[PDB]
Amino acid sequence: TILDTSESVFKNVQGLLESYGGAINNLSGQYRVTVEKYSNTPLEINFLDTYGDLELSDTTGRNKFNSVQASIVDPALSWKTNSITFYNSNYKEQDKNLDKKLQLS
Amino acid sequence: MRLPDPYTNPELSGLGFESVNLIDNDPVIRDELPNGKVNEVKVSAQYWGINISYPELFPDEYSVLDAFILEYKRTGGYIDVILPQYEAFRVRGNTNLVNIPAGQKGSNITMDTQGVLTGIPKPGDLFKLSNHPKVYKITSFNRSGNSWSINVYPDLFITTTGAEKPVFNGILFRTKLMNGDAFGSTLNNNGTYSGISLNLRESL
Amino acid sequence: MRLPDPYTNPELSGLGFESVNLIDNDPVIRDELPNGKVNEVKVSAQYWGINISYPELFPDEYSVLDAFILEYKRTGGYIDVILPQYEAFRVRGNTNLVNIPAGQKGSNITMDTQGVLTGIPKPGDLFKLSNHPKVYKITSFNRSGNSWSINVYPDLFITTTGAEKPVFNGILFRTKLMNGDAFGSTLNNNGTYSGISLNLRESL
Amino acid sequence: MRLPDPYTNPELSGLGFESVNLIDNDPVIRDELPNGKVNEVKVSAQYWGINISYPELFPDEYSVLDAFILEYKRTGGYIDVILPQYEAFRVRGNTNLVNIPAGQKGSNITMDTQGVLTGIPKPGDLFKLSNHPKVYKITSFNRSGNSWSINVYPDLFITTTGAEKPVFNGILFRTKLMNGDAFGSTLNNNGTYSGISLNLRESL
Amino acid sequence: MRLPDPYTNPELSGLGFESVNLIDNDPVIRDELPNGKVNEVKVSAQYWGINISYPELFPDEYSVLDAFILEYKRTGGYIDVILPQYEAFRVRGNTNLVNIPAGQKGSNITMDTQGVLTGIPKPGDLFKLSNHPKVYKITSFNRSGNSWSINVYPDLFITTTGAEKPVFNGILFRTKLMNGDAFGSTLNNNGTYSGISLNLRESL
Amino acid sequence: MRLPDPYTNPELSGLGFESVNLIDNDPVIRDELPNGKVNEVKVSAQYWGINISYPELFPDEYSVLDAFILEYKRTGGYIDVILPQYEAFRVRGNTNLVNIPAGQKGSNITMDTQGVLTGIPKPGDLFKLSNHPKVYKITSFNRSGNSWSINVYPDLFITTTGAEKPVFNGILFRTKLMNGDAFGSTLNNNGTYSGISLNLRESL
Amino acid sequence: MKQILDSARNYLKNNSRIKTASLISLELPGSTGTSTAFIYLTDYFRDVIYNGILYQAGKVKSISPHKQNRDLSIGSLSFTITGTAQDEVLKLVQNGVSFLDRTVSIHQAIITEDGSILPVDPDTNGPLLYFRGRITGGGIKDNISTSGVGTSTITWNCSNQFYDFDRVNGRYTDDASHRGLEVVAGQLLPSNGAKRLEYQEDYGFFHANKS
Amino acid sequence: MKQILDSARNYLKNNSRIKTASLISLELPGSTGTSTAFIYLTDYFRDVIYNGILYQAGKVKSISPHKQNRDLSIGSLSFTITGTAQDEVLKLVQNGVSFLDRTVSI
Amino acid sequence: AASFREFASSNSGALRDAVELALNENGASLKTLGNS
Amino acid sequence: AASFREFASSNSGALRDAVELALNENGASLKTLGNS
Amino acid sequence: AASFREFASSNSGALRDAVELALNENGASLKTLGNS
Structure with a gap:
């Protein structure tokens, strides 16, 4: 990480967290950080525990992708930029061959 | 500062309440769960509400009422109220000789009656602590000789200091007039006032 | 302008009130605390409301009232009124000889009668100061020789200059009319008007 | 174009209004100030509203009514109305000899009666200016020999040109039927029409 | 705690119900298809509602009920009740000797009476399993020798462990009170309370 | 699964409907055009609604009703209903010998009665197709010897396969209980149940 | 403008009560192979046959309005089907599903008194199209009251080819x-x-x- | 997740009527020196003692909900106290006050 | 709907306030448009 | 609240109009977002 | 009006949703403000 301290702290923190998927919380008052995880022992829950109000929503069209490119700064390029990209055959077959490219830096 | 009544003014019998309504207010938030449980959470005080209605009034007793109510409004004090249905003297003795230990809290009181008191309370009696205006109601009572215990509703609003004394007799509610901001009396050509009623809410 | 009545036009015998309803309006902020306390704060003026119902009117007397009300509308003045049941005398004397010390404030007035006045007011009598339109009610009276002390509601709107005179009789309220935008009258088949009524408000 | 009535059609007496309601509408915007002042602002015209009700009607008089109302609807004219309670001829003479000076405006009229008229108006009389359909109402009147003056409500809708003449007799309101957009008559198997009523608003 | 009644306190003869209203609540999603089909799906618990009205009460019995209700509020327990019209016996015997196979599920129960029981239940009788508070209604019964089969509504909340015992008599509902936040009572001038009534709900 | 009735249970005559209400529901969207045309568009099914009311009920017949209704709720089946006012046997013969050609659709049916049937339908008769639960109503009928035709409301919900047969007699509506989600019975101290009523909507 | 056949214009000008059927041809979601099923539905109160294809009746509840203007837009629609039809819920909630493209078409048919579809479009001599496009998303809402009736509903959201x-x-x-x-x-x-x-x-x- | 002690989990699972008190520890505004007073309040219907600190009762009226999510946010709250308590108005309306930082715990 | 259009246009400022509250909560504001 | 969500989403265009009225009054518009 | 201010401020998120729906329909979003 390199931080320009002239950026406002909120925005620097946000970009820093975004770099590794972390998020922070102050429920229970202590400042806490919780990375995303695959957990072996999730908390079990059943519908009947709830108040019974339930809503499911799915937003495939914008959010879904099947190929990607990412850009970085690389010392093997003298700290010029490098551009990784790849496809997924299985995902492109599950989609009806429609190509859709995710952009990242 | 009693609300005038036939016991204070037997000559003005019209002041006898035609009928009285006592309401518990126990504000609570509640929900029903799809598994058929009920869950509820309590915050804020219980309070007693009272409604009073009067018949037609003649001008003299009416003037006595207004002379009271305006004195209350000017002074900003409290209205004391008696409630005749509970006027029974089933417990008596040197109440001020009883010892209540300090640090009792929550809904159970235990007392050393020192063998002094005679008679017993009953469920539904009123009960009051000498140093606080609250009125409680007896749910249940027990003896172990001189030791007594009573379980009381609502829950206690104070921790006992050890200076408190019980009060079984002559309990007066202390209240103020939530209706009072738009008060007023119709006068009919009979020469008699009509339509008076009072809504009271205890206040501490 | 003085409202016409059986004092001003005794021949219009129907023109007196069939009923009245003198209402106190006392705007307050009220708040209810979770500890059961009720807080009240007095802000803005207390003002007397008056509802009046007339009996059935013949056309002539109705036309007189109608013309009076329209003349009030045209001028934009004030409606002056005297309540007859308070009008009944108790105190009499040359009120001009009473002297009120300046600088009195708050709900207690004292005065020197010099012994001039006769009788005493009762609680629930009306009271007024000659230089200001507000009317007050006597909550209680105390004599001490020729000096008098009076507790009034509401509290005084103004500090005594020392030039006031009291007025116990012939007290006129100064008022404004709330129905005026839609007033209207039904000629009954028998030749009378019915329901004629007024919702007056004090104005200061 | 008079609304037919017993005076025009004594044979059809059912057309006599069972009862009539005259309403002043004086649209005004008003507020109450916390110091207890009342303040109000006037805009837009005062107007007279009238409500009429009829009994059960037989087919002939009903047909005469419909033959009138549909003629009004087709022509888009005005409905003239008489109002019997004010039918008194207390003022008479050569009205068209009176001189009203030009430039009178606002609510006071002064006239040179030239000694011509006999009798006097009364408060509550109707009054009208010859060149304008408005109906005013007398609040007050005065004499100084041949000179008269009258203060009149509502305020004048016109400046006097000097061609006007007063009209004390036979005043008809000019009106149109605000109810008329959903008009219609029930017919019962008695052979008699029912449920007729009219709401009228003057129009100029 | 058991609600007091003419079984528990037979001397309080007024304390029985003047009317009751046992309501089924069965929450469903319903949908109406354009082809006219109606679809229904069972989700969440079925729960019994009970409305009760008492007759007029004298003060003593009222005070007993009042104290009971307050003791319930204080403890936060459950109100237990037995309906008398179902209470009428039909089956009798040592229900402890009945044996219920484990793993039964769905709206049909079978059991071995070993011949111990006498009589048979009728449709519309109550039924309960000793280890769980839910109450069920018998829609139909079939004997085969000493084995019994029963169809119940609602469907079982729980699979049979094989340790249950049936209970046909003295079935108590376990309930919670919906009025409790605003309950209040009017002393009639004749010296009685009126309208005393409860909206109970089952809770699981 | 008939709703029990006097014909099924003449001993329980109280089950005879006190009065019945049959409603057509024809959901339609409509507007009124300023040129005075009316335009309307149809979507979704017509359906029959029925309302039933009962008198006071004794416990036996009531128990028979509950034993039915709970069986329906447990099974999730359908309620069959007869409707006595249409119980007339004006058409009879070997209905199952009639041939209906396939591919009839829309609102007209034609049949070869093969000379078999005797009598004729009337407008307002009920009519049903053997393989489908719908109930239709006869608007009109014609003969051409053995050939019949009938125009029927509502429009047909199916295309004819050629296996259908007409059904002129014993038509039962198939329905379910839209009221049923909050069902329950008051019990009065007379020992008699009260306030029962049913709202039914056909379902296919 | 698309020119309709004038017989239809006349019939619509005359008759005051009209019957209309909406006919939905829908590609199944989640064909993991390129070959896909279709399903066919209508909002009409009974099943209807067209081109010999039989369209089922009763699943549909409603269809949104459809707005376009002189600016470019996604021209989105939604339509709703009952949440009680267990199959359709399973049609959403399978994990292996994708529907990033699946096609949809919505015909609009005047149905005459004999139950035939009126000819309107002079190209096909048949019913009009109300809409055509691609699926973009969906959702389920289940509301359970403590008491009384709850509701369940499925929404499908559709758009033109610019949906991203x-x-x-x-x-x-x-x-x-x-x-x-x-x-x-x-x-x-x-x-x-x-x-x-x-x-x-x-x-x-x-x-x-x-x- | 923060793991609660399971006795509490059980008690909450059993009992149907629950009593809850909100306890506010608040730094006074407008300490012109760095040393500051604190005040302690509760919404509960009577005063309550904790760590021997006595928390006054009756001033509080309400407390907002409190939302957080996977994005960064200020996580704001509000709470309300009666406007009739003359002291609290004076606690706001002094001119020399600053409270650009003052701490609060609930 | 049309009544709601008329109402909202008559009360536009409060909507702008509410939007600014949300965006401020995340850390953004419309004033960037004012400068932009 | 949820009813208000459903209503507002069903009437979204009028809200956009009201916001544009306020911003136009100060001299700004969302169209800058359209280009941006 | 004031009641509507209080309500809208209490329900601000739904308004933001509706605005995003309109702008997404035309092809724009407030998130440009978030970055800007």
């Missing part, structure tokens, strides 16, 4: 993109990602980055 205005679909000079490289078993290969099969041959741009 973020899509960038150019070409740029990098071999792995042009050939469509993917990693398998420890080496790179050309695969389906190539915008056309022939490109996989083309070692063009291979030198570009260093050049």
Whole structure:
């Protein structure tokens, strides 16, 4: 990480967290950080525990992708930029061959 | 500062309440769960509400009422109220000789009656602590000789200091007039006032 | 302008009130605390409301009232009124000889009668100061020789200059009319008007 | 174009209004100030509203009514109305000899009666200016020999040109039927029409 | 705690119900298809509602009920009740000797009476399993020798462990009170309370 | 699964409907055009609604009703209903010998009665197709010897396969209980149940 | 304007009560192979046959309005089907599903008194189209009251081909993109990602980055 | 997740009527020196003692909900106290006050 | 709907306030448009 | 609240109008977002 | 009006949703403000 301290702290923190998927919380008052995880022992829950109000929503069209490119700064390029990209055959077959490219830096 | 009544003014019998309504207010938030449980959470005080209605009034007793109510409004004090249905003297003795230990809290009181008191309370009696205006109601009572215990509703609003004394007799509610901001009396050509009623809410 | 009545036009015998309803309006902020306390704060003026119902009117007397009300509308003045049941005398004397010390404030007035006045007011009598339109009610009276002390509601709107005179009789309220935008009258088949009524408000 | 009535059609007496309601509408915007002042602002015209009700009607008089109302609807004219309670001829003479000076405006009229008229108006009389359909109402009147003056409500809708003449007799309101957009008559198997009523608003 | 009644306190003869209203609540999603089909799906618990009205009460019995209700509020327990019209016996015997196979599920129960029981239940009788508070209604019964089969509504909340015992008599509902936040009572001038009534709900 | 009735249970005559209400529901969207045309568009099914009311009920017949209704709720089946006012046997013969050609659709049916049937339908008769639960109503009928035709409301919900047969007699509506989600019975101290009523909507 | 056949114009001008059927042809979601089923539905109160295709009745509840204007837009729709039909819930909630493209078409049919469909479009001599496009998303709402009736509903959301205005679909000079490289078993290969099969041959741009 | 002690989990699972008190520890505004007073309040219907600190009762009226999510946010709250308590108005309306930082715990 | 259009246009400022509350909560504001 | 969500989403265009009225009054518009 | 201010401020998120729906329909979003 390199931080320009002239950026406002909120925005620097946000970009820093975004770099590794972390998020922070102050429920229970202590400042806490919780990375995303695959957990072996999730908390079990059943519908009947709830108040019974339930809503499911799915937003495939914008959010879904099947190929990607990412850009970085690389010392093997003298700290010029490098551009990784790849496809997924299985995902492109599950989609009806429609190509859709995710952009990242 | 009693609300005038036939016991204070037997000559003005019209002041006898035609009928009285006592309401518990126990504000609570509640929900029903799809598994058929009920869950509820309590915050804020219980309070007693009272409604009073009067018949037609003649001008003299009416003037006595207004002379009271305006004195209350000017002074900003409290209205004391008696409630005749509970006027029974089933417990008596040197109440001020009883010892209540300090640090009792929550809904159970235990007392050393020192063998002094005679008679017993009953469920539904009123009960009051000498140093606080609250009125409680007896749910249940027990003896172990001189030791007594009573379980009381609502829950206690104070921790006992050890200076408190019980009060079984002559309990007066202390209240103020939530209706009072738009008060007023119709006068009919009979020469008699009509339509008076009072809504009271205890206040501490 | 003085409202016409059986004092001003005794021949219009129907023109007196069939009923009245003198209402106190006392705007307050009220708040209810979770500890059961009720807080009240007095802000803005207390003002007397008056509802009046007339009996059935013949056309002539109705036309007189109608013309009076329209003349009030045209001028934009004030409606002056005297309540007859308070009008009944108790105190009499040359009120001009009473002297009120300046600088009195708050709900207690004292005065020197010099012994001039006769009788005493009762609680629930009306009271007024000659230089200001507000009317007050006597909550209680105390004599001490020729000096008098009076507790009034509401509290005084103004500090005594020392030039006031009291007025116990012939007290006129100064008022404004709330129905005026839609007033209207039904000629009954028998030749009378019915329901004629007024919702007056004090104005200061 | 008079609304037919017993005076025009004594044979059809059912057309006599069972009862009539005259309403002043004086649209005004008003507020109450916390110091207890009342303040109000006037805009837009005062107007007279009238409500009429009829009994059960037989087919002939009903047909005469419909033959009138549909003629009004087709022509888009005005409905003239008489109002019997004010039918008194207390003022008479050569009205068209009176001189009203030009430039009178606002609510006071002064006239040179030239000694011509006999009798006097009364408060509550109707009054009208010859060149304008408005109906005013007398609040007050005065004499100084041949000179008269009258203060009149509502305020004048016109400046006097000097061609006007007063009209004390036979005043008809000019009106149109605000109810008329959903008009219609029930017919019962008695052979008699029912449920007729009219709401009228003057129009100029 | 058991609600007091003419079984528990037979001397309080007024304390029985003047009317009751046992309501089924069965929450469903319903949908109406354009082809006219109606679809229904069972989700969440079925729960019994009970409305009760008492007759007029004298003060003593009222005070007993009042104290009971307050003791319930204080403890936060459950109100237990037995309906008398179902209470009428039909089956009798040592229900402890009945044996219920484990793993039964769905709206049909079978059991071995070993011949111990006498009589048979009728449709519309109550039924309960000793280890769980839910109450069920018998829609139909079939004997085969000493084995019994029963169809119940609602469907079982729980699979049979094989340790249950049936209970046909003295079935108590376990309930919670919906009025409790605003309950209040009017002393009639004749010296009685009126309208005393409860909206109970089952809770699981 | 008939709703029990006097014909099924003449001993329980109280089950005879006190009065019945049959409603057509024809959901339609409509507007009124300023040129005075009316335009309307149809979507979704017509359906029959029925309302039933009962008198006071004794416990036996009531128990028979509950034993039915709970069986329906447990099974999730359908309620069959007869409707006595249409119980007339004006058409009879070997209905199952009639041939209906396939591919009839829309609102007209034609049949070869093969000379078999005797009598004729009337407008307002009920009519049903053997393989489908719908109930239709006869608007009109014609003969051409053995050939019949009938125009029927509502429009047909199916295309004819050629296996259908007409059904002129014993038509039962198939329905379910839209009221049923909050069902329950008051019990009065007379020992008699009260306030029962049913709202039914056909379902296919 | 699209010119309708004037018989329809006249019939609509005359008759005051009209019957109309909406006919939905829908591609099934989640065909994991390229071959897909279709389902056919109507909101009409009974099933209806068209081109000999039989359209089922009762699942549909409502269809949104459909707005366009002189500016470019996604022209979105929604339509709703009952949440109680267990099959349709399972049709959403399978995990292996994708529907990033699935096609939908919505015909609009005047149905005359004999139950025939009126000819309107002079191209096909048949019913009009109300809408056509691609699926973009959906959702389920279940409301349970403590007491009384709850509700359940499924929404499908549809749009035109621009349903992702973020899509960038150019070409740029990098071999792995042009050939469509993917990693398998420890080496790179050309695969389906190539915008056309022939490109996989083309070692063009291979030198570009260093050049 | 923060793991609660399971006795509490059980008690909450059993009992149907629950009593809850909100306890506010608040730094006074407008200490012109760095040393500051604190005040302690509760919404509960009577005063309550904790760590021997006595928390006054009756001033509080309400407390907002409190939302957080996977994005960074200020996580704001509000709470309300009666406008009739003359002291609290004076606690706001002094001119020399600053409270650009003052701490609060609930 | 049309009544709601008329109402909202008559009360536009409060909507702008509410939007600014949300965006401030995340850390953004419309004033960037004012400068932009 | 949820009813208000459903209503507002069903009437979204009028809200956009009201916001544009306020911003136009100060001299700004959302169209800058359209280009941006 | 004031009641509507209080309500809208209490329900601000739904308004933001509706605005995003309109702008997404034309092809724009407030998130540009978030970055800007």
